[PDB]
Amino acid sequence: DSQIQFTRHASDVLLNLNRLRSRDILTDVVIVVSREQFRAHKTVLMACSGLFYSIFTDQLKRNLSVINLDPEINPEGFNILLDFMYTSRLNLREGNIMAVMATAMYLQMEHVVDTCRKFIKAS
Amino acid sequence: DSQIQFTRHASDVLLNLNRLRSRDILTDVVIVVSREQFRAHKTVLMACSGLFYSIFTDQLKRNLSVINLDPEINPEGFNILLDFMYTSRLNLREGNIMAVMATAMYLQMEHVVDTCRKFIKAS
Ligand SMILES: N#Cc1cnn2c3cc(nc12)N1C[C@H](C[C@H]1CO)OC/C=C/COc1cc(cc2c1NC(=O)CC2)N3
Ligand SMILES: N#Cc1cnn2c3cc(nc12)N1C[C@H](C[C@H]1CO)OC/C=C/COc1cc(cc2c1NC(=O)CC2)N3
Ligand SMILES: [Cl-]
Ligand SMILES: [Cl-]
């Protein structure tokens, strides 16, 4: 529309959301993945994940301070996807591909799942 | 770096943050601007504004649920900048330019201030 577009604004916001997370500022949830914990902002989690969207949009689960992921979710894969959520950068490699794809399916991250598929299809 | 770049991810996150705001989901602050109120997410406000960054990063003001802006801040200009924060789209026109620039200066939004300046310089 008529409005002036700032092509760098969305990435600048995300960069500052990542800094808040690295500074533990206004984080409101702890995600427990086996023997590891990850603090995050529910608004970001919802924005990036069908699983977290379906949890927090429900008034019954909205005020939860702790989420325990299913015991078979690997912390490595969760960490890679949480970083992705806050950076737009996906660290796919040969040693993590299966763990990441499986974690993205669980988190309901369709674009990441399809990218994990293009990766297997390539080289 | 080595990581896969998702060029649409940052704008998709922002779009979903705007939907949360339009759905009054996980908003944690009310900004009072004269006879008007605006609900928002403190994390977004901090990410876009030097004024809100300096408020909420301070442990003494972090848990505030209401912010009353100075009585001379016009609600029109604040509304335009809040929409910008959540969309990357800036609605600058002839009838609002002065109000928007003055509000951006108060909110400490340097890129918007400099853009308001390029606008006066142009046409
Ligand atoms: N307000 C708000 C809000 C905050 N996060 N968020 C997301 C989607 C969303 N709104 C929000 N939608 C999508 C659509 C219309 C609108 C409803 O408000 O509803 C259907 C729900 C779909 C669930 O699946 C996702 C939800 C979100 C993000 C992804 C997926 N699924 C992926 O495979 C990767 C990305 N986040
Ligand atoms: N964590 C976190 C976090 C959340 N929001 N946010 C912002 C900047 C920021 N970190 C955060 N910085 C900037 C720098 C290093 C780092 C310190 O963490 O510190 C100096 C402070 C500057 C204040 O001015 C701004 C602050 C933010 C955004 C803008 C301005 N000033 C503008 O004129 C338009 C944009 N948001
Ligand atoms: Cl995705
Ligand atoms: Cl700015």
Side-chain angles (χ1 to χ4, degrees):
Chain A
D1 67 327
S2 172
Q3 299 176 51
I4 311 169
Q5 187 172 295
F6 283 66
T7 60
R8 297 204 301 129
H9 180 76
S11 62
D12 288 327
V13 167
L14 207 63
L15 193 72
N16 281 340
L17 290 176
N18 204 25
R19 295 175 154 146
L20 288 168
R21 180 179 67 115
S22 84
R23 288 181 64 192
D24 202 37
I25 298 163
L26 291 165
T27 47
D28 57 354
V29 67
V30 58
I31 307 308
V32 179
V33 186
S34 286
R35 296 149 280 272
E36 299 201 46
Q37 282 177 52
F38 301 93
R39 291 200 55 82
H41 302 99
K42 297 178 207 182
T43 53
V44 174
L45 300 180
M46 293 184 81
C48 305
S49 157
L51 186 82
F52 291 123
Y53 171 74
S54 300
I55 296 166
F56 301 124
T57 188
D58 177 9
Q59 252 293 108
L60 173 108
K61 298 155 130 188
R62 198 168 300 173
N63 290 286
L64 280 174
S65 55
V66 194
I67 298 298
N68 288 273
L69 293 204
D70 93 78
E72 263 306 309
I73 296 311
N74 142 254
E76 179 196 25
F78 183 74
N79 185 279
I80 285 147
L81 296 167
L82 185 65
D83 278 347
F84 162 78
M85 294 196 180
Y86 278 89
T87 67
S88 308
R89 303 204 144 171
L90 183 66
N91 182 30
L92 271 187
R93 280 159 178 222
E94 299 179 283
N96 71 22
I97 177 74
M98 297 321 284
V100 176
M101 190 163 46
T103 309
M105 289 177 58
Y106 172 73
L107 294 184
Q108 308 167 212
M109 295 170 78
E110 111 236 328
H111 204 200
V112 170
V113 175
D114 279 300
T115 293
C116 285
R117 286 192 67 162
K118 288 166 191 174
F119 195 87
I120 279 133
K121 207 165 161 289
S123 59
Chain B
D1 67 327
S2 172
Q3 299 176 51
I4 311 169
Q5 187 172 295
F6 283 66
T7 60
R8 297 204 301 129
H9 180 76
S11 62
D12 288 327
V13 167
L14 207 63
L15 193 72
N16 281 340
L17 290 176
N18 204 25
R19 295 175 154 146
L20 288 168
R21 180 179 67 115
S22 84
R23 288 181 64 192
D24 202 37
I25 298 163
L26 291 165
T27 47
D28 57 354
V29 67
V30 58
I31 307 308
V32 179
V33 186
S34 286
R35 296 149 280 272
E36 299 201 46
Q37 282 177 52
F38 301 93
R39 291 200 55 82
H41 302 99
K42 297 178 207 182
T43 53
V44 174
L45 300 180
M46 293 184 81
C48 305
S49 157
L51 186 82
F52 291 123
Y53 171 74
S54 300
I55 296 166
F56 301 124
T57 188
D58 177 9
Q59 252 293 108
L60 173 108
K61 298 155 130 188
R62 198 168 300 173
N63 290 286
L64 280 174
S65 55
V66 194
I67 298 298
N68 288 273
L69 293 204
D70 93 78
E72 263 306 309
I73 296 311
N74 142 254
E76 179 196 25
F78 183 74
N79 185 279
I80 285 147
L81 296 167
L82 185 65
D83 278 347
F84 162 78
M85 294 196 180
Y86 278 89
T87 67
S88 308
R89 303 204 144 171
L90 183 66
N91 182 30
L92 271 187
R93 280 159 178 222
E94 299 179 283
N96 71 22
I97 177 74
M98 297 321 284
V100 176
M101 190 163 46
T103 309
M105 289 177 58
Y106 172 73
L107 294 184
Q108 308 167 212
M109 295 170 78
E110 111 236 328
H111 204 200
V112 170
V113 175
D114 279 300
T115 293
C116 285
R117 286 192 67 162
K118 288 166 191 174
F119 195 87
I120 279 133
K121 207 165 161 289
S123 59

